[PDB]
Amino acid sequence: KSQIPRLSAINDLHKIWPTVEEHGAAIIESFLSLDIVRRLNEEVDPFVKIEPIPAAKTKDHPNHKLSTTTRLVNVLAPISKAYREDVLNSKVLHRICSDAFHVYGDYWVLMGAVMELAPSNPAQPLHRDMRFSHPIVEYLKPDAPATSINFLVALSPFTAENGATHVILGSHKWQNLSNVSMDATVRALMNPGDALLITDSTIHCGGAETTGTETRRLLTITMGISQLTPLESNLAVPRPVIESLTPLAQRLLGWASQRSAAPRDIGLLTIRGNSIEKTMNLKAEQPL
Amino acid sequence: KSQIPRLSAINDLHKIWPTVEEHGAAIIESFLSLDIVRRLNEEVDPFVKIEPIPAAKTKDHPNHKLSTTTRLVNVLAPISKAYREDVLNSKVLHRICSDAFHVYGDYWVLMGAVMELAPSNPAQPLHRDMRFSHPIVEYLKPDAPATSINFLVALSPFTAENGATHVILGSHKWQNLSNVSMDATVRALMNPGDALLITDSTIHCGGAETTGTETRRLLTITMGISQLTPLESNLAVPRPVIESLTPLAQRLLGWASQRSAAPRDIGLLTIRGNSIEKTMNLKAEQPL
Ligand SMILES: CN1C(=O)c2ccccc2NC(=O)[C@@H]1Cc1ccccc1
Ligand SMILES: CN1C(=O)c2ccccc2NC(=O)[C@@H]1Cc1ccccc1
Ligand SMILES: O=C(O)CCC(=O)C(=O)O
Ligand SMILES: O=C(O)CCC(=O)C(=O)O
Ligand code: NI
Ligand code: NI
Secondary structure, three states, X not given: OOOOOEEEOOOOHHHHHHHHHHHOEEEXXXXXXXXXXXXXXXHHHHHHHHOOOOOOOOOOOOOOOOOOOEEEEOOOOOOOHXXXXXXXXXXXXXXXXXXXXXXXXOEEEEEEEEEEEOOOOOOOOOEOOOOOOOHHHHHEOOOOOOOEEEEEEEOXXXXXXXXXXXXXXXXXXXXXXXXXXXXXXXXXXXXXXXXXXXXXXXXEEOOOOOOOOOOEEEEEXXXXXXXXXXXXXXOOOOHHHHHHOOHHHHHHOOOOOEOEOOOOOOOEOEEOOEOHHHHOOOOOOOOO | XXXXXXXXXXXXXXXXXXXXXXXXXXXXXXXXXXXXXXXXXXXXXXXXXXXXXXXOXXXXXXXXXXXXXXEEEOOOOOOOHHHHHHHOOOHHHHHHHHHHHOOOEOEEEEEEEEEEEOOXXXXXXXXXXXXXXXXXXXXXXXXXXXXXXXXXXXXXXXXOOOOOOEEXXXXXXXXXOOOOOHHHOEEOOEOOOOEEEXXXXXXXXXXXXXXXXXXXXXXXXXXXXXXEOOOEOOOOOOHXXXXXXXXXXXXXOOOOOEOEOOOOOOOEOEEOOEOHHHHOOXXXXXXX
């Protein structure tokens, strides 16, 4: 069985989305530089350490799907300069997203999260993303272009033994799911900064951590059309942080109005014919 | 040809959604009391008068679809006490919406707007709503439950001669649109406070104002699943106004997290497993 296609962020940029459209997955080598990875890791470190279990009794939106050996930290903009500057303005990310979502219009971040898996973390069940938040997605016709995609960026090594993600190539086009098996999977073996890119229809799962010693960490960026509601809110992010961002990053975080691709688009999140940013006189690129 | 079914808000409440599901439209008689209509009208009056043309050159999200004799004012919560208290907490509205959207989960306001049509306003072309903002909707399978519905509430009389809305009954189930004609329509003749309820697949249009003297006004409330992005933003609504609302009204305006109907729903607009309202310590029902 064929392995996940591997592509250069630098040279193969126009090939990335076509590859995912065909195969349902691709590895983007050096999606983030080691410097960006180092900074992201340093900045999110304490927030990962303080994060409780996904279904902690203190939470009013517990996540009952993730294992108790998973820590997931979302709403990264207030935590990480590297995320809100380097990642949210990634030229590679934006080329891919505009390639993927042009039929629909603007896209934004549905969720940007760091996931850390403790040693001995079990494999997740094979799944498609979005089914525990956006039931609407299952009602889309089979030829509807993907309405979200997920960049699973390695922040530490992904190896067979430490639970590198499994994907089923071609499963984004499956309607009948009787052949869903771990027998059908291949692995996303990755170095820090590489990214596994999948669609919302790609069947995949986190792997089993079998060493008992290694802690695997990733940055998962679910990018989706601006017509779909994010899993996470940036409503509580301080205004000085928002005003430090680029206009593009502000839009990605829901601090701007949005547009569809409809010829005479009437817009999303507008205020009596004007944008959020015009109405609220939102500054951009103001240093902290 | 059969007329639009007319139902009592008081007595026929459980019948309203089934009627719309079958026929694509229903008139809800006395949906709003005359007192609520009077207050809404008084409160929005000046904002309608100052509103420019839909595609005014001053706007960065011009609406190129509506006629130059249309004034549309959305983001009503800061303008109208009647809207944000009486309308957003309407028992009838909420029964209907929970009937309609239970398959998907929570619902919210995609747009609440007052539309005023000047004398001599022409008929709109026959259309389905949502196509100039949410192209995703056209990609839904035919048996997907409606993901949005629109309450067109009369704030003045709707007569044949003054441009009462046209609908095509049963057109919410049409796939082939070759028989779309004004020949196929019936009229929503309504008194102030009555509401025409349609789905996002019901083919309809504003009628021609033929008197040259009458000014028709309506309150259009597009309610949709919380998985779809609103056409309008309440991000700039003052915190004291938001904190005066019920928790339900806050959710409807995007000042709360949201839930899907998925068995182990992980939520929408959450912040590291907690809600917007818990995170921001958002008060409710605090008088102004
Ligand atoms: C539930 N779930 C997440 O929490 C998740 C986490 C990170 C990024 C995307 C994401 N979206 C999802 O739909 C997944 C789905 C899932 C996960 C584990 C086991 C079964 C299903
Ligand atoms: C464009 N458009 C609005 O502006 C509108 C106004 C009020 C409530 C819903 C609404 N949604 C829409 O999709 C309509 C569609 C339309 C209107 C006129 C002519 C052609 C198409
Ligand atoms: O752990 C991984 O590599 C994948 C995680 C995942 O697919 C998910 O949580 O949705
Ligand atoms: O004017 C009316 O009665 C209907 C308006 C309408 O359908 C629209 O603007 O989408
Ligand atoms: Ni997943
Ligand atoms: Ni309409």
